[PDB]
Design a protein around this nucleic acid. Structure first.
Ligand SMILES: Nc1ncnc2c1ncn2[C@@H]1O[C@H](COP(=O)(O)OP(=O)(O)O)[C@@H](O)[C@H]1O
Ligand SMILES: [Mg+2]
Ligand SMILES: [Mg+2]
Ligand SMILES: [Mg+2]
Ligand SMILES: [Mg+2]
Ligand SMILES: [Mg+2]
Lengths: 1541, 16
RNA sequence: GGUUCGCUCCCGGCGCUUCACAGGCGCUGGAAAAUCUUAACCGCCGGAAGUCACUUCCGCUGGCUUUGAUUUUCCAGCGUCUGUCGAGCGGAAGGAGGGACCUU
């Protein structure tokens, strides 16, 4: 504070004496014993800054109360340079560890707090007595019996008897109560208790005269006549209260914990009935003692207290009890005001009328009180007056406060001088008079008195001790003085000069009161007599007396490490431990004490217990103390209970329930019961749920080994084996335009090719291919051609033709490729077909025999052409030719032949003035020296495209290609003619795309068969299956009555189940990165929605004992993409995924072509070469013809060339990395993103949903071991799955469902659904703030299931209806539909909010404001002015109501009907146009940049500011709201409004 | 029995 | 059929930044309630003991003061988990089109 803190003479001599030895300072209140305590603390601060372990010490300041502890904390903090520690129970030190105490100890130089907290701190070995320097105990006179001060003093006895901290007690009174006889013995007892010597005034000259500033008051007495007569209304009210008591005793409320007498020999009424009985007894006391008007205020107090209790009642019966009490109080109030008005009818002067009714219906005691105030104050300035009024009862304070308010308002002489206020101790009562939340306030009543706002204070004995008040000039005592200490402290409160002390008594009580006062005076003087007469001794060194005084109590126990359990703390410890044990909502866990009878004492014990009492402890089955424990024989039942509790605590510590520090243990974890079983498969892949998976975003991609389907494996034909050839049909869907004439003509030629396999292919759906000329419908024949390879040379011809196709025709060949027949992956061939015996097509043996290799395009000079024969006119149609003189050597097809045309051609628009003959001489005369067959042969030729990836849909557009393309007429003798049929070449052009599509089509067929076999789905459409043509994904972005949802309809009815199409499985397998015309991204949304719903229902059914928090905690891991990735890897599916975008010439491998077998062998067999073979080392290899054809093993040069990379990358520090870049095709490695695998699993789930309903997809989840089975039943049906119990349903009986639901009929009609089990509805409507939440759950758990169900149903509806919308817009629509704001809008639109069972001011006001705004808006969703706040509770209530509607009927169809009848206008409007979120809309604006902010709350209205741009000028708008989200939304809406302008 | 009888308003603050 | 543009646009995925929606959790403050419990003092009524309602002891019960603990609820701020998804930016690849053309 300031340096002006200079002690008095008495303070300095007191601290000087105190440094020498322990003692107690006895000075009147206001003498600054706090100041001398501060000086003592300062004098002992030599070691405060030093650490404890090195020898540093701290000081203790104990206070009897938390409030006084806080006051002393502020005092010591302001008067010292130390940092003070304020430790009380309410601070939360109940579970602080050793470190959490040590840091506080080392950071604080002096410690303050309540006695119990420091007692626990010392006894739990957080500190030791030797670690303390000086101990301060204010109001030490409370240290009697089993007070915590005396326990702390016994801690000195048990601790080391030397090297002990100093102790001082601060007090202004020593005698507690009426022990005013033989005060010397009590003073000696206080001395030995605190092992010190009391010090007080010794020099009458200096100490007394300096203390004189704390003046003694002038003691005055005011008398009133005794009242013998009681009014008639008094007897009427008494009779009514008596009959109400009779009714209450007859009333049968629910069973309550058994309450019994203090010595437990008699039973007592339950606490709740005891409370109303206590309140009515107190009201009767006020009524009898203080008059009718006082009773008229006390009845208001009873009204508000009973209203609060009814508002917080936990049961219908308790509500009925409090309602009966409330109406009886209302009747009493009516009678009281009636009785007042009978006299107020006398005259019209309303102020004088109120004064005279107060005068006439008051008791003479309060009458005298009012006259005394009137004569004492008499229009004095309010700044001068500060007075306290003391009354006994708590409610008397409030009653006198109200009556004095009314009297002041009725007295013009007293109207402005007095500003009354009332204060009650820890047993607080409601200060309001009207209703709940009369006004929010920040200053306490004592602080209002301190600041001068209030000048008259009415208080109980709470203000008597410790609390700092100004020196009051007047003190009044209303009820007679009961204790000596109360009198002394009340007279001490009147501290200022010439202060007035007034006490009230009856006329017949004057002599007894004066006798008691004179006895108090005699005792007060005897205190000084003892102090001035006692002989000087150092520190009361009679240690034998200390031991004899402390030995009466039971000897405490000390365990290992030095912790100590005092016997008087045993009951508290036992009850604290019994609080921890689990139990039902009603079952009492407190120990059931039982006093043993006379015949039991001498049976359990000997005959010694004939007189002394013995008590036994009986404990419920939930706790460990199953064996009964009998107390030691003690002379009183209180000590017997203490001993029994001490022995029980000792037994519990022996059992290990109490820890080393005698505090019960705690729970560890709850959700691990599921992490033990559901997430087992994580471990084998090097992951676990307990570890930090998201460290640096670990491994978002993984490497997988691709595997060809069962049909493509080991399908290579051999000699003599039966073989199957499937003809491939290409049917062009485009028109026969000039641009497309050759394409259309040559695609439908019967010279189709076929694929050779030893295995039998299943039927395959017609599939699309997109060429430049249009789209193709490629289909594979369902019936193969039976062929037998009778000779080995036939097989060799097939193999050489197969290699020649990919090598020369399609130019897929790379130098390091090897043709092989021993590799079994994709071991199959494609052969050409030709018409044989009619429809019996046969292998084109003539073609393969001639075309073992495509002949080289080579030149021929003029003379060589003359030596060669002329080119036959009929040998060119439909044949492939190439320009051997031009730079481009690409092949090109003959589309038209000419004999009328001639190298001496007719001149054209660009060939003007020249024939084509002379044109070739002009252009390339270096090659074309002359033309030898100038006469009669000509051809028209079309180029063929180099494109192989025919999956791109948009490449086939005709708008640009509508423009004419010039012909290319060519002289025949100058171009080499390939005898290969051009129509077969045009079909071979599409071959790689068809092959790659058939690959994954067979994979999808295998998956279809697997998932059909698991479900036992072998019905009619799965053996004679004929697949629909595979459709385009049009949403891929490349170009009254309720209709039942089809998914649920096929879930319930078998007739609507459709076969799981092969194309759908192919789509579910093909990732979006594959660049195809389809993917899984649409199936993923439905799969994810179903997975969410199924996981929610499964967890809520199996684990009903859990809350929504733990259920969500488990579900977030169960449906996580990591879990789905591991789950799908468990199914060995990721080896069949299509993610590669199929670049043939750079990343593909022909089916008949493999790499050198040494590479494959060392890749597979070497862990160092598992994935780390060099890319460019393998891609730089080159092998000879026969080396690549049959040799297999590469040359040593190339072998070492790639083995050097193998060694340098695998057998080095690069181990664990992947070097398979562009050499993925060698062993079939591929890198697939984790989210792709997770979405594959979700898409498979979605396909099975869409095709087979919900139960079959739940069985699929069981197959994927996502839903782990159980021992009783593996897993039940998803529908009719058993979920419910105490947490999803109200446990109340049918007699109170109508008590809680006042008008359930008009919610039943409004919602459109009729409940047969109202218990679900009751919990759905129950907000968590409702009082019954503590016993019968709330809507919070049911809202989880409701959200899952509503989300899945909405997603399924928008999925099945809006078939052309991509997943992004689909989830935007879903988010707009299931937003909390729109859920609240629908809730208010149906007026469901009226039925919410909630009690909360700031929730109800928000609900009312929002519903008023929505009514003003006319139920139109703004997708607002002055920052309207959305009551988030409404959406949760609607979700829980949906869940209740589902659980009542256990049918998703009825639930969907209800949801649709609620959402119909919302669904229509949002399907017409999706309302993107306002923040999203502002951010996505291409011209405006939101740039928001994260400012402060500056009170309730937390502020957010936005920074956007509008027509090139910057603007700054401000958002306000209750929370950050609402303020940001309002700012975004304002920015949108400005942007619109 | 209708009301409290109103005491003599003149009284003295008696010293202890 | 092909080349080319510093040309226009588009799809998907990777890397960085960031937002929205749904289900949550943790930490820190503010507010409210329920239950249990500790200690001390005084009084009413009853019983007992020394001199036997004088003093004391025991019990009932009421009043005041009071300690510690558990649980529930609401609000705000800061982090964070899961699912759906958008936006901005480096960059690669693919496609469409509009120019420059290139064959015959
Ligand atoms: N020597 C002194 N120097 C400074 N202030 C003093 C001195 N003596 C008394 N005071 C003031 O008088 C007040 C005494 O009140 P308090 O200490 O609460 O009285 P008590 O301790 O007797 O209840 C303190 O607030 C203190 O500031
Ligand atoms: Mg003080
Ligand atoms: Mg997706
Ligand atoms: Mg997904
Ligand atoms: Mg919730
Ligand atoms: Mg919700």
């Amino acid at each position: 504070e300031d340096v002006e803190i200079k002690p008095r003479g008495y303070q300095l001599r007191l601290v000087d004496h105190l440094t020498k030895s322990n003692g107690i300072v006895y000075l009147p209140t206001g003498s600054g014993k706090t100041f001398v305590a501060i000086l003592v603390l300062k004098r002992f601060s030599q070691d405060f800054d030093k650490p404890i372990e090195s020898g540093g010490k701290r000081a203790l300041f104990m206070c009897n109360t938390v409030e006084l502890a806080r006051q002393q904390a502020m005092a010591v903090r302001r008067c010292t340079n130390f940092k003070v520690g304020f430790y009380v129970g309410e601070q939360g030190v109940d579970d602080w560890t050793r470190g959490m105490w040590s840091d506080e100890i080392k950071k604080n130089q002096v410690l303050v707090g309540t006695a119990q907290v420091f007692l626990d701190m010392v006894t739990q070995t957080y500190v030791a007595l030797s670690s303390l320097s000086v101990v301060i105990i204010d109001e030490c006179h409370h240290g009697t019996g089993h007070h915590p001060f005396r326990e702390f003093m016994r801690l000195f006895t048990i601790a080391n008897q030397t090297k002990l901290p100093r102790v001082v007690g601060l007090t202004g009174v020593l005698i507690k109560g009426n022990e005013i006889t033989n005060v010397a013995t009590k003073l000696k007892e206080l001395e030995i208790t605190y092992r010190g010597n009391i010090i007080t005034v010794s020099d009458t000259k200096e100490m007394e005269n300096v203390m004189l500033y704390a003046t003694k008051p002038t003691e005055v007495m005011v008398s009133f006549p005794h009242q013998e007569q009681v009014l008639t209304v008094t007897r009427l009210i008494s009779a009514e209260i008596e009959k109400f008591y009779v009714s209450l005793d007859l009333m049968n409320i629910g069973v309550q914990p058994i309450r019994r007498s203090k010595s437990l020999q008699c039973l007592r009424d339950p606490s709740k009935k005891s409370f109303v009985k206590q309140l009515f007894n107190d009201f009767l006391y006020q009524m009898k003692e203080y008059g009718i008007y006082a009773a008229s205020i006390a009845i208001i107090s009873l009204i508000v207290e009973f209203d609060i209790k009814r508002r917080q009642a936990e049961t219908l019966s308790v509500k009925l009890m409090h309602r009966t009490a409330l109406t009886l109080c209302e009747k009493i109030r009516h009678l009281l005001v009636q009785k007042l008005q009978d006299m107020t009818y006398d005259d019209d002067d309303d102020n004088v009328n109120t004064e005279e009714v107060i005068m006439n219906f008051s008791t003479p005691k309060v009458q005298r009180f009012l006259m005394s105030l009137k004569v004492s104050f008499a229009d004095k300035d309010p700044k001068d007056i500060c007075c306290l009024v003391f009354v006994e009862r708590r409610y008397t304070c409030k009653c006198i406060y109200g009556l004095l308010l009314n009297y002041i308002q009725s007295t013009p002489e007293l109207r402005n001088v007095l500003t009354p206020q009332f204060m009650v101790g820890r047993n607080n009562i409601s200060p309001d008079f009207e209703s709940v939340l009369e006004r929010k306030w920040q200053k306490s009543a004592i602080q209002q008195f301190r600041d001068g706002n209030a000048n008259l204070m009415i208080c109980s004995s709470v203000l008597e001790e410790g609390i700092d008040v100004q020196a009051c000039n007047h003190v009044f005592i209303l009820d007679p003085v009961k204790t000596f200490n109360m009198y002394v402290q009340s007279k001490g409160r009147a501290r200022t000069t010439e202060a007035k002390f007034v006490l009230f008594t009856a006329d017949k009580e004057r002599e007894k009161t004066i006798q008691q006062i004179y006895q108090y005076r005699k005792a007060h003087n005897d205190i000084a007599e003892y102090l001035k007469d006692r002989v000087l001794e150092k520190t009361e060194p009679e240690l034998y007396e200390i031991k004899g005084h402390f030995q009466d109590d039971i000897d405490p126990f000390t365990n290992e490490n030095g912790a100590v359990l005092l016997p008087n703390n045993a009951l508290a410890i036992l009850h604290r431990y019994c609080q921890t044990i689990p139990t039902d909502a009603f079952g009492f866990v407190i120990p059931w004490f039982h006093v043993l009878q006379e015949d039991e004492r001498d049976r359990i014990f000997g005959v010694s217990a004939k007189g002394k009492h013995v008590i036994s402890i009986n404990m419920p089955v939930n706790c460990m103390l199953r064996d009964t424990i009998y107390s030691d024989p003690m002379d009183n039942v209180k000590t017997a209970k203490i001993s029994a509790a001490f022995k029980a605590c000792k037994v519990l510590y022996s059992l290990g329930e109490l820890n080393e520090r005698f505090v019960p243990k705690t729970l560890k974890e709850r959700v691990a019961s599921i992490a033990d079983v559901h997430f087992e498969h994580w471990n084998k892949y090097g992951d676990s749920v307990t570890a930090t998976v998201n460290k640096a975003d670990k491994s978002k991609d993984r490497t997988y080994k691709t595997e060809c389907p069962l049909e493509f494996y080991d399908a290579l034909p051999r000699v003599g084996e039966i073989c199957y050839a499937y003809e491939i049909f290409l049917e062009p869907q485009f028109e026969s335009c000039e641009y497309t004439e050759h394409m259309y003509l040559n695609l439908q030629t019967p010279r189709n090719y076929a694929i050779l396999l030893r295995n039998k292919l299943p039927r395959l759906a017609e599939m699309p291919l997109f060429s430049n000329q249009g789209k193709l419908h490629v289909r594979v024949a369902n019936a193969p051609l039976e062929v037998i390879i009778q000779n080995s040379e036939q097989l060799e011809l097939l193999h050489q033709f197969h290699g020649m196709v990919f090598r020369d025709i399609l130019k897929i060949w790379h130098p390091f490729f090897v043709l092989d027949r021993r590799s079994k992956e994709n071991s199959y061939l494609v052969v050409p077909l030709i018409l044989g015996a009619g429809e019996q097509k046969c292998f084109d043996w003539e073609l393969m025999t001639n075309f073992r290799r495509l002949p080289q395009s080579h030149g021929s000079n003029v003379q060589q052409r003359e030596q060669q024969p002329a080119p036959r006119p009929e040998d060119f149609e439909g044949k492939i030719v190439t320009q051997w003189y031009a730079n481009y050597d690409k092949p090109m097809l003959v589309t038209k032949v000419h004999r009328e045309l001639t190298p001496l051609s007719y001149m054209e628009k660009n060939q003007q003035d020249k024939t084509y003959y002379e044109f070739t001489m002009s252009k390339y005369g270096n090659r074309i020296g002359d033309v030898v067959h100038k006469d009669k042969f000509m051809i028209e030729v079309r180029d063929l495209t180099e494109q192989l990836t025919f999956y791109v849909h948009n490449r086939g557009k005709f708008n640009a290609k509508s423009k004419a393309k010039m012909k290319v007429i060519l002289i025949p003798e100058l171009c080499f003619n390939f005898n290969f049929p051009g129509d077969l070449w045009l079909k071979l052009i599409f071959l790689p795309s068809i092959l790659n599509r058939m690959y994954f089509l067979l994979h999808a067929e295998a998956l279809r068969k697997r998932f059909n076999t698991y479900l036992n789905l072998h019905l009619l459409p799965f053996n004679g299956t004929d697949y629909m043509p595979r459709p385009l994904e049009i949403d891929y972005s490349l170009k009254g009555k309720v209709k039942p949802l089809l998914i649920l309809q096929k879930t319930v009815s078998k007739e609507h189940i459709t076969p799981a199409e092969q194309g759908e499985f192919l789509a579910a397998i093909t990732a979006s990165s594959a660049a195809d015309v389809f993917d899984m991204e649409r199936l993923e949304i439905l799969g994810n929605s179903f997975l969410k719903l199924s996981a929610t229902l499964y967890l809520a059914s199996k684990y009903s004992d859990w809350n929504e928090g733990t259920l969500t905690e488990v579900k977030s891991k169960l449906v996580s993409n990591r879990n789905l990735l591991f789950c799908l890897i468990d199914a060995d599916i990721p080896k069949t995924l299509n993610t590669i975008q199929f670049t043939p010439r750079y990343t593909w491998l022909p089916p008949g072509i493999s790499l050198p077998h040494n590479v494959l062998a060392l890749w597979r067999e070497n862990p160092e070469f598992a994935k780390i073979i060099g890319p460019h080392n393998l891609r730089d290899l080159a092998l000879g013809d026969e080396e690549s054809l049959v040799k297999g093993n590469c040359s040593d040069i190339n072998y070492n060339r790639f083995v050097e990379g193998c060694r340098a990358n695998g057998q080095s520090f690069y181990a664990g990395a992947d070097f398979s870049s562009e050499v993925n095709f060698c062993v079939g490695l591929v890198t697939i993103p984790n989210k792709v695998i997770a979405d594959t699993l979700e898409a498979l789930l979605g396909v099975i949903v869409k095709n087979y309903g919900l139960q079959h997809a739940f069985k699929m989840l069981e197959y994927f071991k996502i839903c782990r089975a159980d021992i009783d039943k593996p897993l039940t049906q998803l529908l009719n799955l058993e979920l419910g119990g105490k947490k999803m349903r109200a446990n109340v009986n049918t007699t109170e469902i109508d008590g809680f639901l006042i008008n359930h009929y008009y919610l039943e009609k409004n919602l459109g659904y009729t409940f047969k089990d109202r218990r679900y509805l009751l919990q759905a409507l129950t907000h968590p703030s409702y009082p019954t939440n503590r016993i019968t759950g709330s809507y919070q758990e049911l809202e989880f299931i409701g959200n899952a169900i509503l989300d899945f149903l909405i997603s399924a509806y928008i999925f099945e209806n809006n078939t052309k919308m991509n997943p992004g817009a689909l989830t935007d629509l879903r988010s707009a539909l299931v937003n909390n704001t729109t859920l609240a809008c629908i809730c208010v639109r149906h007026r469901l909010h009226f039925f919410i069972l909630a009690e909360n001011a700031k929730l109800s006001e928000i609900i009312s404001k929002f519903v008023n705004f929505q009514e003003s808006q006319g139920h139109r969703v703004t997708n607002m002015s002055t920052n309207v706040d959305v009551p988030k509770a409404l959406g949760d209530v609607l979700e829980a109501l949906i869940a209740a509607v589902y659980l009542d009927c256990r049918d998703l169809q009825r639930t969907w009907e209800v949801i649709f009848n609620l959402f119909e206008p919302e669904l229509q409007e949002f399907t017409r146009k999706v309302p993107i979120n306002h923040i999203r809309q502002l951010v996505e604006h291409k011209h405006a940049k939101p740039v928001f902010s994260s400012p402060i709350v500056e009170g309730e209205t937390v502020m957010v500011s936005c920074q956007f741009t509008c027509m090139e000028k910057t603007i700054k708008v401000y958002g306000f709201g209750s929370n950050k989200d609402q303020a940001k939304l309002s700012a975004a809406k304002h920015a949108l409004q400005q942007l619109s302008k | 029995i209708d009301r409290y009888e109103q005491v003599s308003k003149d009284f003295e603050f008696i010293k202890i």
